[PDB]
Symmetry: C3
Subunit: 108 residues, 3 copies
């Protein structure tokens, strides 16, 4: 019902209480809601996950002795992580994937 | 593949079973999926979180003896909670924040 | 700051490290982030939840001896599940709901 900055501010000034569409964290929890901790934006705004080791167990990326592969999320703003990743090797080859490691394209 | 109301209804009438893009809750779980309880819309449609105490440990909001601050989510429809909050004091001052308590603007 | 395929690839080639907006999974976790397992697209791309028994305890759907009701998600792509469901009986009657089982409309 009422959930805008000005709509809520005016209601608070007039009635001295929040509109009927609001419930406290306790009430929400009593109903079965458990706050998710999966949105990276909540704990680290403007950041993205990246720098971890990609095993390359499938072998779709070119292997070599001493070469390790790493990954980083691309196009992430907030919410759930997507399927876009950039893969880079210790010797600097760069690949991309937009389908969560199903296929790769060399981009440099 | 097939996931619309009419596409699924016609497939059910013709084949008497769901299309190959559907899996039961058990099957999804066997694969590693665990239903999230973080979407407030699932347990309380049309509602928003609001009314809880805001500590104001940082002191960006004007303090006073006997004055307590509370908050409420703004612009929430469903899914993850955003960074929009309205702050109101026991004596009725009103502020807003759009960056999850980083900065505040007096709006009344 | 830098999170596009070409922006990140060029930064990696020039500086040999990810931009300052990236943090590893460990670092994110140290900060309080716990990867959600609630996005079906992560474990089963292109799939939707469907085929489970709908109890019909409320009785808004026509009951009969030997008739069981089942449901399936509609319009799902990724992220949180929505409120769209198709209900079908053992004897093939088809209904739809767009408000998470509050109201139903016979569609076949």
């Amino acid at each position: 019902v009422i959930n805008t900055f000005d709509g809520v501010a005016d209601y608070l000034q007039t009635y001295h209480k929040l509109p009927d569409n609001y419930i406290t964290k306790s009430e929400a929890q009593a109903l079965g809601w458990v706050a998710s901790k999966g949105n990276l934006a909540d704990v680290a705004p403007g950041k993205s996950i990246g720098g971890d080791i990609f095993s390359n167990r499938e072998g779709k990326l070119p292997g070599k002795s001493g070469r390790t592969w790493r990954e980083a999320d691309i196009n992430y703003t907030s919410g759930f992580r997507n399927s876009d990743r950039i893969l880079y090797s210790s010797d600097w080859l760069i690949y991309k994937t937009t389908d969560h490691y199903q296929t790769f394209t060399k981009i440099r």
